[PDB]
Copies of this chain bind each other. A is one copy, B any other.
Amino acid sequence: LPEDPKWEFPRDKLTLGKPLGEGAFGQVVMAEAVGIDKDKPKEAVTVAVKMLKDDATEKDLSDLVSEMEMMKMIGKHKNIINLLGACTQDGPLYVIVEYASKGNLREYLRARRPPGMEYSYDINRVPEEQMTFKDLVSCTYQLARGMEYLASQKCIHRDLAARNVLVTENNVMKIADFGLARDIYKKTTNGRLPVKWMAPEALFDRVYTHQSDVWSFGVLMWEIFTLGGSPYPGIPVEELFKLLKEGHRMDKPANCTNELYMMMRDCWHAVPSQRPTFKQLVEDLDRILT
């Protein structure tokens, strides 16, 4: 792998830590980096490094490099997990990205559900108490702002879901895993069946567009206002195909205004060209915030 001084970070100044989780690209590990912020070059900063699992092929290795080199292309934004640097030449490939202390969004919302209406036993959070409606509309607004940035850079996400959203310690929403490569199932990875987030054109024809991500914004909105519900609850994958081309759609979440739910279904238009653009989603969510 060629050198890149603009992005290279020395492994001496990088100290690994406890693992965080795993994804389609490998595993992501907590870490600390000394001087990764050039402005404050004697400061330890908490970071997350993305690396391969101990059983990955080179197909998986080029797919880690090809996400890293795409993260350099699309720039930085407040509502995405940004790239900080990399370790290339010696040993394993580390990819250093921003750290979000409050974890991922789906389990953040599930932990803050009302008593007796939990998803699973797990552990609840009453220091966090419970979220308000205005709380919820700004999380999607932040994500619309972030999705409108990625769309403007001609980037397609292909798998936008609440589990792939991350929360910083100031409750900032950060879209993650947007540079992954596309390689043409019933395999639940990380607790989710990804086919339930796909637009019909990507589910039946395996074709993706910025409009297809708009379909996956709609489901994301449904996850948010149900505080982490699971879409199409308990429906077999074999039946979603038939149910989808029949015109059936998900029901209106409680504690959610009609105009938001009528915005939810316009993302689920059968024709991609008929779905809203990210630009008007940002216009409408801003107006609804006040």
Contacts and interface: CB of A to CB of B under 8 A. Distances in A.
Interface of A: 1-4, 6-7, 62, 65-66, 69-70, 72-75, 148, 151-156, 180-182, 184, 200-201, 204-211, 271-273, 277-279
Given A62-B207, A75-B209, A207-B75, A272 B69 contact: yes
Nearest to A179: B154
A152 to B, nearest CB: 4
Among the interface residues A7, A66, A277, which one has the most CB atoms of the partner chain B within 10 A?
A66
Interface of A is mostly: loop
Contact of A201 (B2, B156, B182): B2
A73 B156 contact: no
Nearest to A58: B184
Nearest to A207: B75
A277 to B, nearest CB: 5
Contacts of A184: 66, 69-70, 73
Given A62-B208, A69-B273, 4 more contacts: A152-B154, A152-B155, A153-B279, A154-B180
